Amino acid sequence: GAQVSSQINYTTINYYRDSASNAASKQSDRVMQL
Amino acid sequence: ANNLPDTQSSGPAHSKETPALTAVETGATNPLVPSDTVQTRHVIQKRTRSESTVESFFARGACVAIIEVDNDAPTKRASKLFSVWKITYKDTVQLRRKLEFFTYSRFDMEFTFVVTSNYTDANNGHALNQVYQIMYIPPGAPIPGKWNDYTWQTSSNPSVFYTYGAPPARISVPYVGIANAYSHFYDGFAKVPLAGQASTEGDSLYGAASLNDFGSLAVRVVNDHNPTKLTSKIRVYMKPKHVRVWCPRPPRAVPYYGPGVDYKDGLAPLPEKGLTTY
Numbered sequence: 001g002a003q004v005s006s007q008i009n010y011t012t013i014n015y016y017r018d019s020a021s022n023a024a025s026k027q028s029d030r031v032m033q034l
Numbered sequence: 035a036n037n038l039p040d041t042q043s044s045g046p047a048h049s050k051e052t053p054a055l056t057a058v059e060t061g062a063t064n065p066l067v068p069s070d071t072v073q074t075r076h077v078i079q080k081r082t083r084s085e086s087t088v089e090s091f092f093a094r095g096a097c098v099a100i101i102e103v104d105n106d107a108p109t110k111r112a113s114k115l116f117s118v119w120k121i122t123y124k125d126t127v128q129l130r131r132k133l134e135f136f137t138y139s140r141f142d143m144e145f146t147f148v149v150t151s152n153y154t155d156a157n158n159g160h161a162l163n164q165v166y167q168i169m170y171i172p173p174g175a176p177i178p179g180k181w182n183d184y185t186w187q188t189s190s191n192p193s194v195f196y197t198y199g200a201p202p203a204r205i206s207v208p209y210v211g212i213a214n215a216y217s218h219f220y221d222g223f224a225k226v227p228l229a230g231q232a233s234t235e236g237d238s239l240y241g242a243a244s245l246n247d248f249g250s251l252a253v254r255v256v257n258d259h260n261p262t263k264l265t266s267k268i269r270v271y272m273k274p275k276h277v278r279v280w281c282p283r284p285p286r287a288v289p290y291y292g293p294g295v296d297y298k299d300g301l302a303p304l305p306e307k308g309l310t311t312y
């Protein structure tokens with residue numbers, strides 16, 4: 001439901017079915033044989 | 035005669051280990067297997083080296099001498115009623131080369147004598163079956179001077195009497211060397227010349243140890259002569275047995291010239307081949 005996140009917190013709720021509608025969440029090496 | 039290691043599956047490699055690179059300056063041979071440089075599958079190896087053991091390599095009778103004798107009237111000075119062959123493997127080449135792959139060897143020896151005979155003319159009657167005496171004369175024993183002198187009593191020498199038409203005669207001897215092994219090569223002399231000795235003293239052949247190291251075989255036809263001359267050849271076949279060998283050497287590349295390592299002819303064995311020609 002409601003997401004409480006530290007910034008003293010803030011609340012985010014997604015109102016849309018599609019995730020795209022969501023707001024942006026800011027959270028020796030010289031010698032070798034092959 | 036041991037079996038051979040299986041080939042193990044080997045996949046891609048990307049690492050600092052470089053088996054391909056080496057340094058032959060050290061004198062060692064890089065012991066690489068195919069899996070060291072290419073991708074390989076698993077192969078259960080079934081081949082073995084049973085036929086390249088030294089025993090298997092020498093387990094063959096090789097002809098080392100053809101001793102010709104006659105059965106003829108002793109008044110015929112052209113005929114040779116007995117023959118003395120000094121024992122050696124250096125009268126032929128094949129067995130010599132095989133032996134000289136190595137510097138030292140110990141082996142018992144099997145001698146097999148194949149005797150053939152024939153008439154020389156057709157106007158002097160026929161002959162009854164001949165018997166041949168093959169007497170070993172160890173060094174120091176008296177050498178026969180005539181086909182019927184006392185030495186043929188062979189009271190102490192071993193002798194083989196072979197009846198013509200019988201299967202080739204055969205005897206065996208153990209390792210009889212006075213050293214702990216036979217020396218195929220001897221880098222030395224029998225004598226060391228000493229300062230002040232005349233030029234005719236202290237001189238010996240290079241590489242010879244004994245003037246008579248293994249003695250001789252004296253061969254005669256025991257029968258008294260028929261009215262017609264008969265000629266016979268005794269072919270001697272040597273087979274080393276229970277062979278041990280030390281210090282391998284590069285094999286003879288140019289024709290043998292005498293019992294030493296000397297060479298005179300055929301000094302161009304390699305043929306011509308382009309550098310970039312397959």
Ligand SMILES: O=C(O)c1ccc(NS(=O)(=O)c2ccc(N3C(=O)c4ccccc4C3=O)cc2)cc1
Pocket residue numbers: 097098099100101102119125126269
């Ligand atoms: O028929 C073959 O098996 C036989 C035929 C040829 C052959 N090689 S050869 O070069 O022709 C050859 C031919 C003769 C002799 N040879 C003699 O002439 C002789 C005289 C007295 C004692 C020993 C030997 C002896 O080895 C050595 C080598 C060897 C054996």
Ligand SMILES: CCCCCCCCCCCCC/C=C/[C@H](O)[C@H](N)CO
Pocket residue numbers: 121122123143145168169170192194205207210211215216217218243247248
């Ligand atoms: C009828 C009986 C005959 C028995 C003859 C016994 C002699 C055995 C000789 C074996 C030959 C060995 C090979 C030669 C070895 C080297 O050349 C010598 N060490 C160097 O001359």
